[PDB]
Amino acid sequence: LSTISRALTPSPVMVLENIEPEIVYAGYDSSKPDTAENLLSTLNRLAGKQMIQVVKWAKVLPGFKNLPLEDQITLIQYSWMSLLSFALSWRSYKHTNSQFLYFAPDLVFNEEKMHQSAMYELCQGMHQISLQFVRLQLTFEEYTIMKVLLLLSTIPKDGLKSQAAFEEMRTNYIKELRKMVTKCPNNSGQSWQRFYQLTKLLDSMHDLVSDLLEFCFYTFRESHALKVEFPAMLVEIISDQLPKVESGNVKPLYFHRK
C-alpha cells in the first residue's frame, strides 16, 4: 500500500502470470480400456481437480474479491467449461503445438481418443481453437488476460447482484488487454487488429463451450446409466448450472455482435 510499493509492484498481467495454477494430473488408469465410460470419468475427475485450482486462482484474482460472494460463485459456475477449455487449448498449444489435446501430462488425446471419448466433433472444434493459438502465436500475456475475460463472459439473463461492480471489473481487464496489444501487436500487424483477433477468438469459444456443456449435462443427467463418474465439485457446479442454462437463464457477453 506504500507509494513506492504501489508504483513498483508487479503489473496486473505479471500478477496473473504468478497466480497461474500448477500442473494437474488426471490419474490415468492404464488397467482400464479407453472407452467413453472411462475417458469421460477420467476427464471429469481431472476437471474436478482443475476446478479446485480455478477457485484458488479466482480467490487471489485482483478485483474478484470486490464482487459479492453470490456473484463470484455465479461467475465460476457459468464459466467453468470456458476456463477449462481455454486452458486446455493453451496447454495443447505449448506442449504439442496444437497437434493434440493435452488435458494433462498423463491424458493427451489424439484423434483416436477423440473418437473413443464419444465427443469427436467437440474435440475437433476445440482442437481448431487450439490451432488459432498457433496462427496467432498467442502469448502467455494475452492468454492470462483472456482467461480472466472468460471468467467474466457469461452471466445470468437478468444480470448479477452487483452488475456495476462486475462491469467495472470486466472493463478493467478489457483495458489490460488493450494496453497489452498496444505494446505488443505481435504477428497481427496493428494493435487494433490484434485486439480484434483475440476478442473474436474469445467469442468463437461460446458455441463450442455451449456444445460441450450440452453433452456434459446429458451425461450428468444419465450418469448412473452411462457409468460416467462425476466428482463432487462437478456435481455441485452442474446441479446449479444445468437448470439455469437449460431454462435460458444465461447471457453470453460477446465482444462482437452476431
Ligand SMILES: O=C1COc2ccc(C3=C(c4ccc(F)cc4F)C(=O)OC3)cc2N1
Ligand atoms: O461427462 C462428460 C461429457 O461432457 C464433457 C464435456 C467436456 C468435459 C471437459 C473438458 C473438455 C473441454 C474441451 C474439449 F474439447 C473436450 C473436453 F473434454 C475439460 O477440459 O474438462 C472437462 C467433460 C465432459 N464430461
